[PDB]
């Protein structure tokens, strides 16, 4: 809930202008502006990531429909426990953003691994990888960024790490759980999957974009499902 979409940007607006306009609400960790290399100009929008979700929230309230460089801008969510996002592309088509809360309070090692794999801060991660196993009414599995078939992946700690605990249960759809010997592979549940309780470590939940998860499930893969971008 830390990443914001910012649209309606005049040509003169750039990453410096955005930093200056949004920093009053709190520290910012990243600013991305898609470019058209044929023109060398941006496409009128950007994504601003705040350090704190509370600050991102205050920014949405005060900046949405505000004026920047003479015109009205649009600001909204793009898609203590870390929150991360994945932007999903299905076939050649953007599907939207899934936002996830990681339960560092319950499973700190498991949450930290997934967090780092979203940011790529350890030198590798999920960006550009696929959901290679998708079963309707069950789950969508990804994170195999080395072999892309369920045989690969690696954690930030080495090839594998221990099951921390089984406190969190598979109680319904939209939960994050480790595939397994934990590495980087994970799944997003599409129903209650309680037969996996005590076998797979649950470590997070979808907070925004359940609809995007349902679009992934709809491919259960009939079309490639790619993590086009991700981060914290």
């Amino acid at each position: 809930k830390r990443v914001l979409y910012v649209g309606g940007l005049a040509e003169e607006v750039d990453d410096k202008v955005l930093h200056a306009a949004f920093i009053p609400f709190g520290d910012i960790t990243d600013i991305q502006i898609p470019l058209d290399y044929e023109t060398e100009k941006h496409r009128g929008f950007a994504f601003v990531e705040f350090e704190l979700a509370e600050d991102a929230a205050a920014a949405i309230d005060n900046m949405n429909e505000s004026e920047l460089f003479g015109r009205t801008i649009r600001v909204n969510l793009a898609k203590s426990n870390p929150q991360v996002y994945m932007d999903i592309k299905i076939g050649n088509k953007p599907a939207g953003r899934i936002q996830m809360l990681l339960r560092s309070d319950v499973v700190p090692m498991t949450a930290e691994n997934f967090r780092c794999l979203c940011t790529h801060e350890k030198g590798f991660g999920f960006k550009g990888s696929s959901f290679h196993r998708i079963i309707p009414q069950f789950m969508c599995q990804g994170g195999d960024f080395t072999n892309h078939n369920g045989t690969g992946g690696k954690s930030i700690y080495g090839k594998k790490f221990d099951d921390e605990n089984f406190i969190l249960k598979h109680t319904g759809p939209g939960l994050l759980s480790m595939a397994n010997t934990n590495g980087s592979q994970f799944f997003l549940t599409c129903d209650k999957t309680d037969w996996l309780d005590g076998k797979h470590v649950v470590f997070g939940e979808v907070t925004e974009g359940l609809d995007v998860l349902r679009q992934i499930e709809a491919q259960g893969p009939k079309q490639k499902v790619i993590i086009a971008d991700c981060g914290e």
Partner: protein, 236 residues
């Protein structure tokens, strides 16, 4: 650069040589800001001149405002030099308007070149003959409330042309304040007569025209009649 930082900690022409050798420019602008702050007369303006020698430009224009008249217009020329055009230019027009009517009218013109500028220029016309021209053009640009505004302009500015624009408002909407728009021509018995003929074309407005040639509660029940068993109420 670290040596430049330690030298900055140590910290005028020779010092400028040491600084330029140390370089970066943002620190120099910060130094000019330090001069403008520490001086807070004419020597500060000289520091602004050295700052001009150094080459945020809008911030320099703000310092020029702090220096406050043709020289300020020269500073406006420097602001024009700073960029071909986005909000900072609007700030320049804002400083131009806040304080030489031509300085505001020109910025209002450039704002007119690109609708909010037309709105601010409309506010400038609201501040005021030429402003009346801008306002009448704003109404004639092609809304009944705006027609009421133009009628207010007739009430202020300036008569037959007002009758023509009133004819335009009448053709635009034959509905009950139009007689009052005709009343401006009386400034009245004739405009009231137009209010009467309009009543024939359709209440108290004709009587007001009669006073111009020279109970409100019953006029109000009559207004209830004027609302667009119900007919029986119109009878009562």
């Amino acid at each position: 650069l670290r040596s430049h930082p330690l030298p900055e900690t140590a910290v005028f022409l020779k010092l400028s040589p040491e600084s330029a050798e140390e370089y970066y420019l943002k620190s120099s602008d910060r130094l000019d800001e330090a001069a403008q702050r520490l001086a807070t007369v004419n020597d500060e303006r000289f520091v602004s001149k050295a700052g001009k020698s150094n080459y945020h430009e809008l911030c320099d224009l703000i310092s020029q405002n702090p220096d406050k008249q043709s020289l300020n217009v020269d500073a406006i020329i420097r602001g024009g030099l700073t960029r071909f055009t986005q909000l900072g230019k609007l700030w320049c027009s804002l400083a131009d308007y806040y304080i030489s009517g031509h300085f505001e009218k020109a910025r209002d013109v450039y704002e007119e070149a690109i609708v909010m500028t037309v709105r601010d220029f409309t506010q400038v016309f609201d501040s005021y003959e030429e402003s009346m021209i801008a306002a009448k053009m704003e109404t004639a640009s092609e809304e009944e409330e705006d027609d009421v505004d133009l009628e207010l302009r007739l009430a202020r500015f300036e008569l037959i042309s007002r009758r023509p624009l009133l004819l335009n408002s009448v053709l635009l909407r034959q509905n009950h304040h139009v007689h009052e728009w005709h009343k401006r021509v009386a400034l009245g018995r004739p405009r009231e007569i137009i209010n009467t003929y309009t009543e024939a074309v359709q209440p108290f407005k004709a009587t007001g025209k009669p006073h111009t040639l020279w109970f409100y509660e019953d006029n109000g029940q009559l207004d209830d009649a004027r609302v667009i068993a119900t007919k029986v109420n119109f009878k009562q």
